[PDB]
Each structure stands twice: as C-alpha cells, then as structure tokens.
Amino acid sequence: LDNGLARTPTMGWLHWERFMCNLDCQEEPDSCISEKLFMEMAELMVSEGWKDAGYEYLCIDDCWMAPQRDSEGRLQADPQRFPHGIRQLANYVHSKGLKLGIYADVGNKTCAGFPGSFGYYDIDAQTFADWGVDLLKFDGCYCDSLENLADGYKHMSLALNRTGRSIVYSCEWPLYMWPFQKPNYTEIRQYCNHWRNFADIDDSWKSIKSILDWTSFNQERIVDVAGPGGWNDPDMLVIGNFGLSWNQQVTQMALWAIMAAPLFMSNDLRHISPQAKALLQDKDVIAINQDPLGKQGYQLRQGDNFEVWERPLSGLAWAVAMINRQEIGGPRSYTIAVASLGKGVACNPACFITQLLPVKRKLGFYEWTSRLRSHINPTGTVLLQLENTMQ
Amino acid sequence: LDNGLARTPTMGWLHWERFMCNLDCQEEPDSCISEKLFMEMAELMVSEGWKDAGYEYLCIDDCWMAPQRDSEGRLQADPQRFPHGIRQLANYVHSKGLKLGIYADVGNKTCAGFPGSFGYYDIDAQTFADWGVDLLKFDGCYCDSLENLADGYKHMSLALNRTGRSIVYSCEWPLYMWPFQKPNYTEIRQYCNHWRNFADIDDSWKSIKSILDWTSFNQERIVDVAGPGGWNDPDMLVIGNFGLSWNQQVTQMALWAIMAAPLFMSNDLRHISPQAKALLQDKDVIAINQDPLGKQGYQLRQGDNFEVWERPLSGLAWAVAMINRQEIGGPRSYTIAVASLGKGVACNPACFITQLLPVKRKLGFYEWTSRLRSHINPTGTVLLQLENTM
Ligand SMILES: *[C@@H]1O[C@H](CO)[C@@H](O[C@@H]2O[C@H](CO)[C@@H](O[C@@H]3O[C@H](CO)[C@@H](O)[C@H](O[C@H]4O[C@H](CO)[C@@H](O)[C@H](O)[C@@H]4O)[C@@H]3O)[C@H](O)[C@H]2NC(C)=O)[C@H](O)[C@H]1NC(C)=O
Ligand SMILES: *[C@@H]1O[C@H](CO)[C@@H](O[C@@H]2O[C@H](CO)[C@@H](O)[C@H](O)[C@H]2NC(C)=O)[C@H](O)[C@H]1NC(C)=O
Ligand SMILES: *[C@@H]1O[C@H](CO)[C@@H](O[C@@H]2O[C@H](CO)[C@@H](O)[C@H](O)[C@H]2NC(C)=O)[C@H](O)[C@H]1NC(C)=O
Ligand SMILES: *[C@@H]1O[C@H](CO)[C@@H](O[C@@H]2O[C@H](CO)[C@@H](O)[C@H](O)[C@H]2NC(C)=O)[C@H](O)[C@H]1NC(C)=O
Ligand SMILES: OC[C@H]1NC[C@H](O)[C@@H](O)[C@@H]1O
Ligand SMILES: OC[C@H]1NC[C@H](O)[C@@H](O)[C@@H]1O
Numbered sequence: 040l041d042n043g044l045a046r047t048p049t050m051g052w053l054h055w056e057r058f059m060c061n062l063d064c065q066e067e068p069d070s071c072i073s074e075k076l077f078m079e080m081a082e083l084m085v086s087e088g089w090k091d092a093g094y095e096y097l098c099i100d101d102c103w104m105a106p107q108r109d110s111e112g113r114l115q116a117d118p119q120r121f122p123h124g125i126r127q128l129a130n131y132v133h134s135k136g137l138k139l140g141i142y143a144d145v146g147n148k149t150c151a152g153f154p155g156s157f158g159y160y161d162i163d164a165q166t167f168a169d170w171g172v173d174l175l176k177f178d179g180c181y182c183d184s185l186e187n188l189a190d191g192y193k194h195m196s197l198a199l200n201r202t203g204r205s206i207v208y209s210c211e212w213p214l215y216m217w218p219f220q221k222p223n224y225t226e227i228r229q230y231c232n233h234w235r236n237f238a239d240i241d242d243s244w245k246s247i248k249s250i251l252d253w254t255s256f257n258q259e260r261i262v263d264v265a266g267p268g269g270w271n272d273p274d275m276l277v278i279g280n281f282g283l284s285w286n287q288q289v290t291q292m293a294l295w296a297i298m299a300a301p302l303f304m305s306n307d308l309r310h311i312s313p314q315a316k317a318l319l320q321d322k323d324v325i326a327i328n329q330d331p332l333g334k335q336g337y338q339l340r341q342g343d344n345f346e347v348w349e350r351p352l353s354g355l356a357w358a359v360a361m362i363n364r365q366e367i368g369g370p371r372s373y374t375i376a377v378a379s380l381g382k383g384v385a386c387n388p389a390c391f392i393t394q395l396l397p398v399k400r401k402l403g404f405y406e407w408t409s410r411l412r413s414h415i416n417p418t419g420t421v422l423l424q425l426e427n428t429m430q
Numbered sequence: 431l432d433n434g435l436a437r438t439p440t441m442g443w444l445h446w447e448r449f450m451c452n453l454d455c456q457e458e459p460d461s462c463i464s465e466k467l468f469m470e471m472a473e474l475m476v477s478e479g480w481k482d483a484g485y486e487y488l489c490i491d492d493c494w495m496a497p498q499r500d501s502e503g504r505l506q507a508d509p510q511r512f513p514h515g516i517r518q519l520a521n522y523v524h525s526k527g528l529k530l531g532i533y534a535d536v537g538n539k540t541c542a543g544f545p546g547s548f549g550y551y552d553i554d555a556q557t558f559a560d561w562g563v564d565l566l567k568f569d570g571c572y573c574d575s576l577e578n579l580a581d582g583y584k585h586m587s588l589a590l591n592r593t594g595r596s597i598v599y600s601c602e603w604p605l606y607m608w609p610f611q612k613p614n615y616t617e618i619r620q621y622c623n624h625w626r627n628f629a630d631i632d633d634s635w636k637s638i639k640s641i642l643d644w645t646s647f648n649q650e651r652i653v654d655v656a657g658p659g660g661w662n663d664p665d666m667l668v669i670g671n672f673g674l675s676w677n678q679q680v681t682q683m684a685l686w687a688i689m690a691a692p693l694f695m696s697n698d699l700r701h702i703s704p705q706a707k708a709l710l711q712d713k714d715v716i717a718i719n720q721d722p723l724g725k726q727g728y729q730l731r732q733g734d735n736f737e738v739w740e741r742p743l744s745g746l747a748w749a750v751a752m753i754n755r756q757e758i759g760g761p762r763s764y765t766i767a768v769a770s771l772g773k774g775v776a777c778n779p780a781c782f783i784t785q786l787l788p789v790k791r792k793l794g795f796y797e798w799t800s801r802l803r804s805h806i807n808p809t810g811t812v813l814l815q816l817e818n819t820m
Contacts, residue, residue: 056758058759058760066763067763070760242758244634246757280760280808281807281809282675282757282808284674285675366637368448368452416672418673
C-alpha cells in the first residue's frame with residue numbers, strides 16, 4: 040500500500056492472544072478488555088523501554104464494541120468497559136508518544152459477533168479518523184462470497200485514504216480467501232500495509248512449527264511480494280507468556296526478524312521475565328527485522344531435522360537462521376560452507392560473522408573457502424550476522 | 431517385588447533421553463557415553479545437593495556394551511569408552527555414597543543392537559552382581575513371542591534374587607506386551623520393582639500431555655497395583671533440558687509426585703538453570719512423591735480444558751494438582767468445593783491448605799463448606815497440600 044506507512048514492518052502490541060475476549064470485569068478485572076488495560080499497557084511500554092526498542096502501536100483487538108451502533112449509524116465503545124470512549128483513550132495514548140490501533144470486521148459481525156463494517160465502510164473509516172486511530176486490523180469473519188470479501192477489503196482501503204489520515208491498514212484478506220482459491224498477493228499488496236496469511240497462533244511450539252512450516256512451504260508465492268509498505272503477517276509475538284521454552288522463544292524472535300514479519304507482542308507486559316524482556320528488546324535483532332532494504336528471508340535448506348533460513352540485509356549484510364527440529368537428545372552439530380551462504384556473496388572474499396542468538400558472540404573472520412561449525416539446541420535457533428570485508 | 435527395595439519410588443539419574451546413543455567420542459567428547467560422563471555426573475550429584483535431595487542411583491542406559499561377550503561367557507564394557515570396566519566404575523560410584531545402575535535386554539540384542547541377555551540370564555545376573563551393580567533396567571527389544579517376553583522377564587528376576595545382592599529390578603514388560611494383549615499388572619508387580627507402561631519420552635510438552643493423557647485413561651487398570659515395592663513408570667524427568675517451558679516443567683514435577691512415579695533425571699547436570707535445579711530439588715515436592723504410605727494418585731475430574739488430580743498421603747494429608755490444558759489466553763480461574771476433595775475426608779471438619787507449586791504459599795484454613803479458588807497458568811499446574819484439621 041503506497042501510503043507512506045510501514046516503510047519497515049510495524050511494531051507494537053495487541054491484546055488478542057493473551058487477553059482474548061474476556062468481558063467479565065466482575066471476577067476477572069485484571070484481564071477484561073477495559074480502557075484501564077490499555078491505559079496500563081501504554082503506561083508501561085514507555086517506562087520499560089518498549090518504545091525505545093521501537094514498539095509504537097498499542098492495538099485494541101476484537102471485543103471493544105457496544106451491542107449496536109448509536110443513532111446516526113456509528114460504532115460505539117462499551118459504555119461499561121470503555122466509559123471514556125475511544126476519543127479520550129486516543130488522546131491519552133498519544134500523549135504518551137504512542138500510536139493507537141483498533142479492530143473491525145469486513146462482514147456483518149466481528150468474529151465475536153459485534154457489528155460488522157459492511158454497508159458502513161465509508162462511515163466507520165471516518166468515525167475512526169475522527170477518534171485519532173493510527174491503525175486498523177480489518178478482520179474477515181461473516182462473509183457470504185469471495186466477491187464481498189474482495190470488494191469489502193478494497194473499499195475500506197479507499198475510505199481510509201480519503202479520510203485524510205495516516206492509518207496503517209492491516210488486512211486478513213488472504214487467510215479467509217485461502218480455503219477457496221489462491222490469493223492474488225500482487226493485488227493484495229496494493230491495498231494493505233500487511234496481510235495475515237495462516238491460522239491463528241497459540242501459546243504452542245506446535246503452532247509456531249506449523250506457521251514456519253506452512254510459510255516456508257509456499258514461500259515461492261509470498262517472499263517476493265514482501266517489501267516496504269507491504270508485509271507478510273505470520274501473526275503475533277507470543278514470547279513472554281507460558282507455552283514456549285527459552286529456545287522456542289528464540290526460535291520465534293529469530294525467525295520473525297528473518298521473515299520480515301511485523302512485531303506485535305501479545306502479552307501481559309506487567310508480568311514478564313527479565314529473560315523475555317531482554318529478548319523482546321534485543322537491539323541487534325530488532326535491526327535485522329527492521330532492515331531498511333526490506334527483502335523477506337526464506338528457507339535456504341532443509342533436512343536431517345535441521346533448517347536453514349537466511350535474509351539479505353542492506354550493505355552486503357545477511358542474516359542466517361539455523362533451526363534444529365529434533366526434539367530429543369542434546370545440542371547437535373550442523374555445518375556448511377559459507378560458499379553456500381547469501382547466494383555466495385557475503386563471504387566473497389571473506390565475511391565477519393558474529394552470533395546474535397541464543398547469545399551475543401563475535402566469531403572470527405571467514406574466508407570464502409571456510410565452513411561454519413555450530414551446535415544448535417533442540418527446538419532452538421542460532422542466529423548469525425554475516426558482514427562484508429575485504430580484510 | 432518383595433525384595434526389601436523401592437520401598438518409596440527410586441530416585442536418581444539416567445543418561446538416555448539427554449545423551450542417547452552417542453558413541454562418537456572423537457567429535458562430541460562431552461556427550462559420548464564414556465566412563466568420564468558418569469564420573470562427572472556422579473561427582474556433581476554429590477556437590478550440587480542432588481544426593482541430599484534424595485537422588486541416589488546413577489544409571490547407565492543402553493549403549494555401554496562391547497560388540498560381543500568375552501570367552502566365557504560374559505558381557506563386556508566398551509574397551510575404548512569404558513577402559514576401566516564397570517567393576518571400577520562401581521567402586522568409584524560407591525565411594526561417593528551413590529549406587530550405580532546398568533542396562534540390558536530381554537532379547538537377542540539391545541534396542542541398539544548390542545548382545546541381549548537371552549540364554550545368558552543366569553550368567554548376566556551374576557556378572558552384574560560381581561561388579562556391584564545396584565540397579566538393572568531390563569529392556570524388551572528383539573523378542574519373537576510374548577511367551578519369551580514373559581519367561582525372560584521372570585527368569586531374570588529369580589536370577590538376580592539368587593545372586594544374593596540387593597539389585598533394584600526395573601522392567602519394561604508391559605510396554606512391550608501392550609500392543610498385543612493387556613498386561614497382568616498383578617503378576618508383573620510380583621517380579622518387578624517398577625514397570626515402564628507407555629512410549630518413550632521426548633523433550634516435548636506434547637509427549638508429556640500424551641503420557642498423562644494415556645495414564646489417566648487407563649488408571650482403572652494401574653493405579654491400584656501401585657505401592658511400596660512396585661511402581662508405575664511414566665519415564666524420565668526431562669526438566670532442565672530445552673523443550674519445556676517453566677509451567678511445563680512444573681506440570682511435570684507435580685504430576686510425577688502425584689503419580690508416585692520414580693524420579694529419574696535425564697539431563698546434563700553440568701549445565702542447568704537455577705530455575706530447574708531448585709525445582710528438581712524441591713523438598714516439599716519430593717516429600718509428596720516420597721510419601722511413606724505409597725498410594726498412587728489419580729484423575730479426580732476433567733473437562734473445561736482443566737484437569738484435577740489428587741493423591742492421598744499418610745496422616746490425613748492429600749495432594750491436589752490442578753492442570754490447565756488451554757494453550758491460549760492467560761491465567762484461568764478454576765474452583766471446586768473442598769467437599770469434593772480427597773473423597774471427602776481432608777477438610778472434614780476443615781483443612782490447612784498450603785500451595786507448593788508454582789510458588790510455595792500458605793493459604794488460610796478451609797472449612798468443610800468452603801470452595802477453593804484458583805488461577806492456573808496455561809499448561810501449568812497448581813499443586814496444593816491439604817492437612818485435615820483434626
Ligand atoms: C492516499 O492516496 C494516495 C494513493 O496512493 C497516496 O499518495 C501517495 O502518497 C505517497 C506519500 O509519500 C507518495 O509517495 C511519495 O512519492 C514522492 C516522490 O514523487 C516522495 O516525495 C515520497 O518519498 C518519501 O518516501 C520515499 C520512498 O521510500 C523515501 O525514499 C523518501 O525519503 C520520502 O520521505 C514518496 O515516495 C506518492 O507519490 C503518492 N501517490 C500519488 C497518488 O501520487 C497518499 O499519500 C494517501 N494519503 C493518505 C492520507 O492516506
Ligand atoms: C532370539 O532369536 C532366535 C532366532 O535365531 C530365537 O531362537 C529361535 O526362535 C524360533 C521362534 O521364533 C524357534 O522356532 C527356533 O527353534 C529358535 N532357533 C534356534 C536355532 O534355536 C530366540 O528364542 C530369540 N529369542 C527372543 C526372546 O526373541
Ligand atoms: C529374594 O526373595 C525374598 C522373598 O521374596 C526376599 O525376602 C523378603 O525380603 C525383605 C528383606 O529381606 C524382608 O523384609 C521380607 O520379610 C522378605 N520376605 C520373605 C518371603 O522372606 C529377599 O530379600 C530376596 N533376596 C535377595 C537378596 O534378593
Ligand atoms: C494375573 O496373575 C495373578 C498372579 O499370578 C493371578 O492370581 C493368582 O491366581 C492363582 C490361581 O490361578 C491363585 O492361586 C493365586 O493366589 C493368585 N496369586 C495372587 C497372590 O494373587 C490372577 O488371577 C491374574 N489376573 C487376572 C484377572 O487374570
Ligand atoms: O476475534 C477473531 C480474530 N481472528 C484472527 C485475529 O488474530 C484476531 O485478532 C481476530 O480478532
Ligand atoms: O534402546 C534403549 C531404549 N529403548 C527404549 C526404552 O523405552 C528406552 O528408555 C531405552 O533406554
């Protein structure tokens with residue numbers, strides 16, 4: 040989407056995977072979708088260095104609506120859980136130096152069942168723009184035919200542009216189109232800052248595996264569409280929660296940066312391990328995700344329950360991610376000739392390889408002729424940066 | 431097995447899951463099955479407080495044999511990876527105040543392919559007893575028919591008793607027998623200090639779930655056989671390794687204590703988080719696994735992606751483990767009336783409930799009439815101890 044926005048992949052936070060559709064403020068106040076929730080997440084992002092890291096978009100997800108619309112025809116917040124309305128939440132958010140994201144649906148209902156945007160595309164867009172929204176997640180539940188999905192998705196893009204406001208439009212167009220026919224990513228790219236590709240994400244090394252595996256499966260179709268202003272969305276960062284071990288949390292971080300995925304944390308910020316914070320806030324690794332060049336990574340090689348990913352970065356740099364898919368035994372050794380790395384460019388005549396994950400460590404120089412040895416942890420990932428030189 | 435042994439479930443450590451059958455000492459010396467491996471694990475168990483915790487059995491698994499037997503007769507260690515022989519390893523291990531375990535097979539070959547024990551039952555047994563072995567894992571690969579499995583398993587048990595030596599006999603009888611016919615656990619109990627029931631274990635929350643899920647599935651059949659001298663083995667403690675998150679590692683610890691499973695750590699002791707060390711060495715939680723009464727726990731209730739387990743302990747005590755199987759969102763609330771707990775005994779007229787896991791915390795008194803409230807972590811377990819008034 041030629042809108043000036045998402046020049047690198049959007050970073051921020053999103054309630055869904057951690058807070059889902061909890062609307063019982065009575066017994067579970069500390070996790071119902073209330074303004075205070077975002078009031079508090081926002082408040083933190085600032086004080087805990089999430090902004091300096093580069094997370095900027097506090098994003099509301101599904102389950103913020105009232106039962107129905109006011110009498111014009113406009114979406115409202117919940118009067119109970121959002122007494123102050125979005126108008127003020129926006130104001131507050133902004134004062135913190137952040138941007139606010141919101142949710143709505145292409146259909147007749149959200150995936151939860153609160154009013155859809157259909158028929159109301161023109162009016163929702165403006166309604167949002169009046170509030171001070173800086174992002175939209177546009178979901179695609181409750182849709183008759185592909186024709187409505189397509190026209191609906193497109194029609195919203197136009198209505199947002201018209202408002203006059205810089206609003207990151209994030210779409211789920213392909214995910215929903217998928218089961219019926221291949222999506223025209225070329226065309227999608229035209230209307231959406233970024234698009235959701237596969238199933239929802241869990242707190243499971245299983246779910247992760249299946250995303251990478253499905254992603255890598257049809258990379259031929261998606262890696263190339265990806266660049267400045269339009270990204271492949273493999274869904275939220277779940278690091279900080281419960282489901283993944285350390286090496287699985289690295290694997291997540293590494294491959295999201297490799298894949299040039301947007302980085303949307305979905306977690307209680309108020310209870311997070313030094314572990315994960317420091318991982319989530321890794322300067323070097325955010326860089327790689329955030330590389331100005333904007334070429335998506337891919338799966339170079341595979342087999343022997345090992346996986347090789349790599350991403351080209353600007354300045355003759357390249358990222359190498361090596362995964363170990365054997366769940367059993369110990370650290371396994373895996374080695375390749377740097378001759379096979381970066382299509383053969385980085386490391387001609389030589390490259391400087393420093394390791395970023397699981398721990399930050401310079402490794403020597405590396406002639407064209409040489410091989411890189413390595414011990415990767417079961418279900419973990421080793422993340423290298425290869426630099427050019429000349430020495 | 432009426433042998434004076436495993437009066438509470440055996441604790442120690444086992445190479446397999448973490449080190450497997452790595453025999454390449456050239457390129458991976460830090461993890462090949464070498465005496466120095468056991469020399470090192472032993473040395474640590476001592477210094478790191480693993481012994482004081484109650485881990486006592488340093489256990490060699492598969493892949494310690496030579497190509498073939500001496501002439502006699504007898505099984506040998508690898509000349510290269512075990513130059514000093516088991517004789518000496520035993521001696522050393524003992525001097526640390528620990529007990530050595532070894533491995534062999536019912537069949538013609540181990541699961542790897544090194545000589546089986548068949549035909550050699552009488553001689554293997556003695557061989558081991560000469561070496562000073564204190565445990566045997568008897569595996570059941572490479573077996574024609576169930577008859578040989580049965581007779582082979584049994585025959586060994588007698589040969590061991592006869593040696594004259596206290597040797598904890600750990601069998602894999604049921605697991606192999608399964609896929610053909612239900613096992614007679616009554617019978618097995620008679621010959622084995624503990625028995626492996628299900629598939630191997632991985633470094634996966636998957637694998638865990640499936641073990642509990644399979645165990646609770648047929649608890650009818652197995653929970654009652656269990657008690658002093660004969661345990662159900664749900665396979666190794668894998669905490670400390672790579673594959674499980676914290677709340678998954680607690681879930682494992684809690685439910686191993688609930689189940690009255692033996693505690694066999696399989697990990698590199700030389701590189702382990704404070705996290706895991708403290709969890710593996712939890713006094714209170716070992717106690718519950720170690721309760722002298724020795725009744726196995728079971729699944730009280732299930733549904734709503736929540737699971738309630740409970741074990742009765744001596745002295746009107748009971749353990750309650752509540753697991754949360756929803757892998758999404760956050761801490762879920764789950765509650766029941768203490769009236770339902772421990773068949774209705776603990777908490778009549780009242781109980782003291784202190785939480786052990788995830789963090790050790792007293793909770794007040796709990797009248798008969800009261801319900802216990804609780805926020806359990808996704809894939810975690812909350813593990814309580816109920817003391818009845820009284
Ligand atoms: C909605 O309507 C249109 C529909 O596409 C959209 O117009 C486009 O807006 C962008 C806004 O930047 C324009 O892109 C610019 O093109 C000119 C060159 O002619 C440059 O000034 C801009 O350069 C910036 O970005 C560069 C690209 O990487 C950077 O290198 C550089 O540093 C600059 O900062 C940018 O390329 C584009 O020309 C128009 N297209 C049209 C229709 O003419 C509009 O912005 C949208 N409006 C809203 C409110 O959503
Ligand atoms: C180990 O393998 C040998 C086969 O070489 C078994 O001995 C034979 O087993 C078959 C039964 O399937 C008998 O019919 C033969 O008479 C035996 N052959 C000989 C030459 O003695 C042996 O019992 C096997 N044992 C186990 C437990 O698998
Ligand atoms: C071999 O078998 C006998 C009988 O099962 C074991 O005897 C029991 O051993 C414990 C410890 O000696 C006693 O507490 C029980 O009272 C014994 N019961 C019987 C039947 O006498 C014996 O210990 C075993 N011996 C060895 C060394 O393996
Ligand atoms: C499983 O085997 C057990 C143990 O042998 C069987 O119980 C024995 O049965 C014999 C008669 O066949 C009795 O005389 C013994 O007293 C029993 N042993 C003991 C001490 O219990 C048992 O019947 C078998 N189980 C089933 C249900 O098939
Ligand atoms: O609630 C439905 C759900 N579909 C998929 C998205 O991840 C989520 O935010 C959206 O709200
Ligand atoms: O190969 C030996 C190996 N076979 C499978 C068993 O279950 C495992 O624990 C044993 O050590």
